[PDB]
Structures are given as C-alpha cells and as structure tokens.
Specification:
It comes from Solanum lycopersicum (Tomato). One of its GO terms (molecular function) is RNA binding. Keywords: Ribonucleoprotein, Ribosomal protein. This protein has about 100 residues and is α+β, with helices and mostly antiparallel strands. Helices cover about 40% and strands about 20% of the residues. It contains four helices and four strands. The protein has a four-stranded mixed beta sheet with strand order 1-4-2-3, with helices on both faces. The radius of gyration is 12 Å and the shape is globular. About 25% of the residues are buried. Bound molecules: potassium ion and magnesium ion (MG) (3 copies). It binds one RNA strand of 76 nucleotides through helix 2.
Length: about 100
RNA sequence: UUUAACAGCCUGCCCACCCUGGAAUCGGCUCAGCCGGAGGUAGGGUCCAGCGGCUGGAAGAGCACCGCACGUGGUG
C-alpha cells in the first residue's frame, strides 16, 4: 500500500484535502498527484479525472473509502480526494 | 378607549440555498438532538412564512361622552 509513503507527505510535503481545494490546485497546476477514495461519488470521480487529464496530472485510485483515506492522512475526518503539491519524499516517482 | 377584505411598500422568523475562505490545541450548536475537507466556524448574500410592520381603504365609519332642538353640532 501507499500508507507509508502518504504518511511522509503529511509531515514533510504540501497537500490539500477535500474536493473544492483539489480542483483549485488542478486549475493552478500546483497539484502533482491526485488520490481518490473508492467510494467517491461516481460523478465527482469522473469530473476529477477529467480535470486531471486536462492538466496532465496523474491520478491514483486509493484502495479504500473516504474513511480509510482520511485515517491514512492522519486526520479524524473523511477525505474523498486529495492533491499532493510537494511530494516531500519519493511519492510521485513510485506510483 | 375600535380599525375589515383588498392594494402597494417594508420586514425576512425556523429552514433551505449561494459566494469568499480552508478547520486538531477540533470547533459550532439544541430543552432534546445534532452538524463539518461530501467544506465547519467566521464574513457577506439569496430565497421562503406571516393571522408581522407602515400607508392607502379610513374616519367621512363605529363607539363613548357633552350640547343644541325635539334633526343637528362639538370633544375623545
Ligand atoms: K378575502
Ligand atoms: Mg454562512
Ligand atoms: Mg390609515
Ligand atoms: Mg368620528
């Protein structure tokens, strides 16, 4: 899994959690990798992927729901999707 | 010791909704709940209810009281 690599970003890299900020980072091209939970709304999932394809940003489908993804990020709330701005330590390379 | 339908304007309950923004030292919140990265708090807006407010209707009416005549005037 990517929980170990994702944990490193939470303390050494730059990221935005949530659907509204993820679109913002894709619009400004600050996002380098987008991670989406498996229970994300199907329409929202397609919209994010279309945005990422338009901005030439890689998309990773997380193996877990928004509850699991939020826990992986070390947060006490659900996260449907997130964007990584600064990888920090070998997250965008091996994905 | 009063103020109808109706007409215009204002107000904008409890909710719902929109924009900005991005939250752990978690916070907001009800009598009770409960709500928030599926975007809270906060700031600024939109909409909805009315058996709500103002004016018109409408004081010319009604009521009370005091007169003059035996209808008519005044005050509130
Ligand atoms: K009526
Ligand atoms: Mg608000
Ligand atoms: Mg009046
Ligand atoms: Mg009168």
């Amino acid at each position: 899994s990517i929980n170990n690599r994702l944990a490193l970003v939470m303390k050494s890299g730059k990221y935005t959690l949530g659907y509204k900020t993820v679109l913002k980072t894709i619009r400004s091209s600050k996002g380098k990798l987008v991670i989406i939970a498996n229970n994300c709304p199907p329409l929202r999932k397609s919209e994010i992927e279309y945005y990422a394809m338009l901005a030439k940003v890689g998309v990773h489908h997380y193996n877990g729901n928004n509850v699991d993804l939020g826990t992986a990020c070390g947060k006490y709330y659900r996260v449907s999707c997130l964007s990584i701005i600064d990888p920090g330590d070998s997250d965008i390379i091996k994905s």
